[PDB]
Amino acid sequence: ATLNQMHRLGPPKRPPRKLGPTEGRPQLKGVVLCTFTRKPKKPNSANRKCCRVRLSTGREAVCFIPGEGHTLQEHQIVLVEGGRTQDLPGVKLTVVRGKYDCGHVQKK
Amino acid sequence: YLELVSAALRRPGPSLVLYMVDLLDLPDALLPDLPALVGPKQLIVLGNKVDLLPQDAPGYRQRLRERLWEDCARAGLLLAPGHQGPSRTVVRDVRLISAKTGYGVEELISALQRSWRYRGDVYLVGATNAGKSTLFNTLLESDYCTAKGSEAIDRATISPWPGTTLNLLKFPICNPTPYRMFHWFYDTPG
Amino acid sequence: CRLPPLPTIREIIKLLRLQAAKQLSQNFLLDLRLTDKIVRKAGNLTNAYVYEVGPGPGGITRSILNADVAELLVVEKDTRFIPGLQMLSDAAPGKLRIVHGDVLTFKVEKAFSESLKRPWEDDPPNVHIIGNLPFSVSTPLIIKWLENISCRDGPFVYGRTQMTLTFQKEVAERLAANTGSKQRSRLSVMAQYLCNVRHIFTIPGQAFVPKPEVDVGVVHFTPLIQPKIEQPFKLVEKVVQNVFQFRRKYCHRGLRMLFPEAQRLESTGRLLELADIDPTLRPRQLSISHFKSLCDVYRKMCDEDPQLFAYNFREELKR
RNA sequence: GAUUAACCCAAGUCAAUAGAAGCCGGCGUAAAGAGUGUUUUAGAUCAAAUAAAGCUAAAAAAAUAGACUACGAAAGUGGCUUUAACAUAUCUGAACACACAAUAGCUAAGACCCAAACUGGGAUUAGAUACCCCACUAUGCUUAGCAACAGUUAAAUCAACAAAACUGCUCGCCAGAACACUACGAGCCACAGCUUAAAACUCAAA
RNA sequence: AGUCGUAAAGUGUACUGGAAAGUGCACUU
Ligand SMILES: [Mg+2]
Ligand SMILES: [Mg+2]
Ligand SMILES: [Mg+2]
Ligand SMILES: [Mg+2]
Ligand SMILES: [Mg+2]
Ligand SMILES: [Mg+2]
Ligand SMILES: [Mg+2]
């Protein structure tokens, strides 16, 4: 582009950055509605532990529960953070272990 | 109305009624009384003031059209939309318009100038606040009218209603297109 | 039930004495698996009487016999395949009844017993037709059988017999086309006011051993209890043909040709006005109700004018 | 996963989130430059055409010349005569101005020799010829309507492939798949069908 | 997926009811 064209158009204008599942917040509080398991996309095979939660913003979302063994039931309060579960499509939220009802993974 | 205007509107021949109903003011208590008011002739229900309605959800217009259809159904009105085949009051169409913004008026004109059965005189019936006068002014200044001059004073004429002294406006209209390949407008008291 | 193995294309070339693979002038479906699919889509054939047309090598025959049919009537035109079908009959005694003759003239109405004849308004009468014929023969056949449904004769003396026929993909689409679709044509209306027509699935050309340059559709017909036009078949055929002769022009441009020139202008208008057809409707936008209206008014016009129904405008343009 | 050992930082560590952090790069094939001419506030330095009348020879449209390459802005123009007649003394600059031009698809009327999808009829194997013959439609006809410009060949020319690379100057255009997918709906229709979309979303590719 | 089987010519567009593709119109080598 010529100097006149760049003067006309002006400085480049970066589009506003996209808000993620947490809407630009570190963590979010949520209420568990139901627990289930999902199957990974296939270079891999497993039964990943997931749960649907209603967030404080009112939106519902599927979250992955890390670690071996969880005791989450319906109506329990959890704190969920960002981070994609790479093998589960559409699962962008992860439950924080050791906060509210979701306890730490039992040793061994 | 029943003792003065219904006589002319129950003269046999080719005729059409553009019944106008205010969308905000529903249910219409005048709707069940149409069979006696106008008689057993073709009727198009026009929901006016649709632009003034908040859009509660997508497709609210279809819900309003349906609601008008069941409101016609509850009364003893025959619902015969679209092609029917080779009497009592028959509702041909339910069309949402807004005379102020001219939303749906042009499509109304196109619908009126596309069918065999919409032949003859048009009688714009309605209630007082339905908004009849705005629609009359809108339709008056359009290709729908057979204009001989531009000024709206001469284009529309005043005539006394038959059998009475009620002077009302009227402008002459065109026959629908099928009647050239191989009639007056009327506003009635609200 | 053990049956002989399917003949490979080598044995088929040897059997037809061509000695080469590029001279068949015919495409065979030698995939018993797709034929299993077709026979599955034909419905539940358990203890059914199947009239199978265009047997050929016998993939469809083997698939049907694999289902527990009662009698399987086979009608083959070629005599080089009767040996294979006789071996099939011997392998499955009592079920395969082979016949030699043309399907366009064979009389199915006497083939099966008269204890299978159900009434027209009741369920389909346990008698099925399955067919993988040359596309040069399936179109005349379906026209003939549509006339038979209109007259309630022929294969439909047993009632509402269901048909499963293979057509070309375009022809199948047109047979099962909806109003306004780009495939809506004469064949759509002619099939659809007499039958429930369903284009189930398409078999690509690469699945046939000599691969054709076309796809193949499978279409299922079920005669309708109440036909959507109660007129003679030839009258409806004439009306539909004259409507669809000009597919891209308004419907009146095609409907004016039903009448002599002398009364063309007035008679066409009278037809349209006693019907309620908006003359700006193009032929693909006409439902079967519009054709019912036109057919009723045209039957009237013929009944108060004897000469009209035989009129052909090209026979008048010759002079 | 546990355990051993190692590594980094350390009264911290680092999981999530949000910032800091980026257009003087390109537009033949990857995203991105041609239908033609004129004009236009500014910016730059580079100050055998066409339309009319007439007329025709072989068999309405024009063999030879034409191995010619002219005229015209482009599309296009090549039978003869006559009459008008072929803008402009710098360049760039239009979706919105004026002229043209072509390409689809429908709408009205009109002509119809000839040809001809469809539609009928005749003949043919042993699923005949899809293919031959006859007849006749739509249509083919006639109206009226809907990268530029100036200079360089000096350099290592030179991702490849095309079409040897270059500068200067200006306009338009380009910032993953994605000219993705999808009908919440809208119009026509009038119970069951047709036409009409962007965005999210997802992925580490394309 | 195998505990499955086997060895002149083109490009568009329109119509196609004797459509395993055909014909019509315009183009390309
Ligand atoms: Mg801390
Ligand atoms: Mg490109
Ligand atoms: Mg210029
Ligand atoms: Mg001819
Ligand atoms: Mg430019
Ligand atoms: Mg054909
Ligand atoms: Mg072709």
From Swiss-Prot, chain A:
Region annotation Disordered: where it falls in the sequence: 6-26
Alphabetically ordered keywords of this record: Mitochondrion, Ribonucleoprotein, Ribosomal protein, Transit peptide
Keyword Transcription among UniProt keywords: no
Location relative to the cell: Mitochondrion
GO biological process terms held by the UniProt record: mitochondrial translation; translation
GO cellular component, one term: mitochondrion
Superkingdom per UniProt: Eukaryota
Name the record gives this protein: Small ribosomal subunit protein uS12m
Organism ancestry: Eukaryota, Metazoa, Chordata, Craniata, Vertebrata
Residues of the full protein shown: 31 to 138 of 138
UniProtKB/Swiss-Prot annotation, chain B:
Record domain CP-type G: where: 2-190
Localization per Swiss-Prot or TrEMBL: Mitochondrion inner membrane
Disulphide bridges, residue numbers: none
Family under the similarity heading: Belongs to the TRAFAC class YlqF/YawG GTPase family. NOA1 subfamily.
Quaternary structure (record): Homodimer or multimer. Interacts with mitochondrial complex I, DAP3, MRPL12 and MRPS27.
Function: Involved in regulation of mitochondrial protein translation and respiration. Plays a role in mitochondria-mediated cell death. May act as a scaffolding protein or stabilizer of respiratory chain supercomplexes. Binds GTP.
Protein name stated in the entry: Nitric oxide-associated protein 1
Residues of the full protein shown: 201 to 499 of 698
From Swiss-Prot, chain C:
Localization, UniProt: Mitochondrion
Effect of V103A: Inhibits rRNA (adenine-N6,N6-)-dimethyltransferase activity
Annotated EC: 2.1.1.-
Keyword Magnesium: no
Reactions catalysed according to its record: adenosine(N)/adenosine(N+1) in rRNA + 4 S-adenosyl-L-methionine = N(6)-dimethyladenosine(N)/N(6)-dimethyladenosine(N+1) in rRNA + 4 S-adenosyl-L-homocysteine + 4 H(+)
Gene3D superfamilies noted in UniProt: Ribosomal RNA adenine dimethylase-like, domain 2 (1.10.8.100), Vaccinia Virus protein VP39 (3.40.50.150)
GO biological process: rRNA methylation; rRNA modification; transcription initiation at mitochondrial promoter
Residues reported in the UniProt entry to bind S-adenosyl-L-methionine: L29, G54, E76, K77, D102, V103, N132
Pfam family membership, one: RrnaAD
A single GO cellular-component term on record: mitochondrial matrix
Expressing tissues: Ubiquitously expressed.
Consequence recorded when altering R174E: Abolishes the interaction between 12S helix 45 and TFB1M
A GO molecular-function annotation: DNA binding
Effect of G56A: Abolishes methyltransferase activity, DNA-binding and SAM-binding. Does not abolish transcription activator function
Record's note on what induces expression: By the nuclear respiratory factors NRF1 and NRF2/GABPB2 and PGC-1 coactivators.
Transit peptide: 1-18
Self-association state and partner proteins as the record states: Interacts with mitochondrial RNA polymerase POLRMT. Interacts with TFAM. Bound to the maturing mtSSU until the late stages of assembly.
Function statement: Mitochondrial methyltransferase which uses S-adenosyl methionine to dimethylate two highly conserved adjacent adenosine residues (A1583 and A1584) within the loop of helix 45 at the 3-prime end of 12S rRNA, thereby regulating the assembly or stability of the small subunit of the mitochondrial ribosome. Also required for basal transcription of mitochondrial DNA, probably via its interaction with POLRMT and TFAM. Stimulates transcription independently of the methyltransferase activity.
Protein's name according to its UniProt entry: Dimethyladenosine transferase 1, mitochondrial
Lineage summary: Eukaryota, Metazoa, Chordata, Craniata, Vertebrata
